[PDB]
Design a protein around this ligand. Structure first.
Ligand code: HEM
Ligand SMILES: CC[C@H]1OC(=O)[C@H](C)[C@@H](O)[C@H](C)[C@@H](O)[C@@H](C)C[C@@H](C)C(=O)[C@H](C)[C@@H](O)[C@H]1C
Length: 403
């Protein structure tokens, strides 16, 4: 037959049309990606079922007989650094996942996030102060990007002389291009080194930050985080703590700008903003694809996925399933967004949801309330989308502030 290769332009040029075509044909279809055979789940029910099925592991460190487990997101990562990226809750299965998440939840709380609101609002104001009030500016470089980074650095205790650097590393890690596999693996080692230093200096000079707190956190029945776990969790909190938020702000800005009717709605009714954020995530999900490994044979949507298969749950395609979201291709800030899979589903549900919504709301509100004449500086069709199934986004978005 003819198997699709996720590396083709069909998955990067009007891709939601390609997911649509695949879905109606087969909601669970075999594909080729990065040289391996995998299974792409495009249907809503099938995707939701797969995330809820624990036979589909999240752990890339598990060893099986005559099997070489290879998650495409670790393309080019040496084993030592791979292990540093994969010893946290998102790369663990129960009961390991259970205690890891339990320990972290004790400190990464809603109270701590809420206590950050005035700071987030303060940082937003400042960045907007610096862009001016006329002409064209790169809203990503000048706003969408710095904001989440400054917020996460304060939450984690990352000081001035450290920030920015990781910015360039993370960019490399976001794309999975076999040609640049060694550069990708190189950037990965850089972040691992940076984190090792961060953690060490934090053990020596403790503060009020989340990292310090996770260092002394302990539970009577679950004990505490080991050095490796602490190091890996710190690493993922830093990276996952800002990247997806950059995508939310930037994609969100592009969408409101391109949907005047929807933007006006938000301007008129600020209470319609929280749901606009949820509709932004549903419309174009940043984590377009999440990976799972079939430890056992699993039947999804009538299809029997062979044991030891790599399954790619297309969260983004699922959010566009007609049977779940009527007229899914219509960006509507007023629609019911309940059930979208952008924050996950099941035991690995997004822990940072509270912070992500806070950032998206505060940021978009400020941006648009500050520049009532804001518009795109390029034709909508010219916007360049990040070519990644791992974390979709816009790296350059020129806007005109005054009009
Ligand atoms: C727009 C924002 C965000 C989106 C779209 C997003 C999306 C997701 C998704 C899809 C998952 C599930 C992964 C899976 O099933 O394998 C997840 C997990 C997670 N997210 Fe978020 N996330 C966002 C922001 C954040 C932030 C701000 C933080 C941290 C401060 C965060 C921390 C995490 C963590 C640690 C997990 C793993 C939880 C677990 O494995 O049990 N996320 N996120
Ligand atoms: C290099 C692979 C890793 O990617 C990243 O850290 C990316 C920079 C993040 O943006 C990812 C995509 C997040 O936004 C969340 C969706 C998932 C995250 C919290 C995980 O737990 C997950 C295991 C993740 O660490 C890996 C996919």
């Amino acid at each position: 037959a003819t198997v699709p290769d996720l590396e083709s332009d069909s998955f990067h040029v009007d891709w939601y049309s390609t997911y649509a075509e695949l879905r109606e044909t087969a909601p669970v279809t075999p594909v080729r990606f990065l040289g391996q055979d995998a299974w792409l789940v495009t249907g809503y029910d099938e995707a939701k079922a797969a995330l809820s099925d624990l036979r589909l592991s999240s752990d890339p460190k598990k060893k099986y007989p005559g099997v070489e487990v290879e998650f495409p997101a670790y393309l080019g990562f040496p084993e030592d650094v791979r292990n540093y990226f994969a010893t946290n809750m998102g790369t663990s299965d129960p009961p390991t996942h259970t205690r890891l998440r339990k320990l972290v939840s004790q400190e990464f709380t809603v109270r701590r996030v809420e206590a950050m609101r005035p700071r987030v609002e303060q940082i937003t104001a400042e960045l907007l102060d610096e862009v001016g009030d006329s002409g064209v500016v790169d809203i990503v470089d000048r706003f969408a990007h710095p904001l989440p980074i400054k917020v996460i650095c304060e939450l984690l205790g990352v000081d001035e002389a450290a920030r920015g650097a990781f910015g360039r590393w993370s960019s490399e890690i976001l794309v999975m291009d076999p040609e640049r596999a060694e550069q990708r693996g190189q950037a990965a080692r850089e972040v691992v080194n940076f984190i090792l230093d961060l953690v060490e200096r934090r053990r020596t000079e403790p503060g009020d930050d989340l990292l310090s707190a996770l260092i002394s956190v302990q539970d009577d029945d679950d004990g505490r985080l080991s050095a490796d776990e602490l190091t890996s969790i710190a690493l993922v909190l830093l990276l996952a703590g800002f990247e997806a938020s950059v995508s939310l702000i930037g994609i969100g800005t592009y969408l409101l700008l391109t949907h005047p009717d929807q933007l006006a709605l938000v301007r008129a009714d600020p209470s319609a903003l929280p749901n606009a954020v949820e509709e932004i995530l549903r419309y174009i999900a940043p984590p377009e694809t999440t990976t799972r490994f079939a430890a056992e044979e699993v039947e999804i949507g009538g299809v029997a996925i062979p044991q030891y298969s790599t399954v790619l749950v297309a969260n983004g395609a699922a959010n566009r399933d007609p049977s779940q979201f009527p007229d899914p291709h219509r960006f509507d800030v007023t629609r019911d967004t309940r059930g979208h899979l952008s924050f996950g589903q099941g035991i690995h549900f997004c822990m940072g949801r509270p912070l992500a919504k806070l950032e998206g709301e505060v940021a978009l509100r400020a941006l648009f309330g500050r520049f009532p004449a804001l518009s795109l500086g390029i034709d909508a069709d010219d916007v360049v989308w990040r070519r990644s199934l791992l974390l979709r986004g816009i790296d350059h978005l020129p806007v005109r502030l005054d009009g």
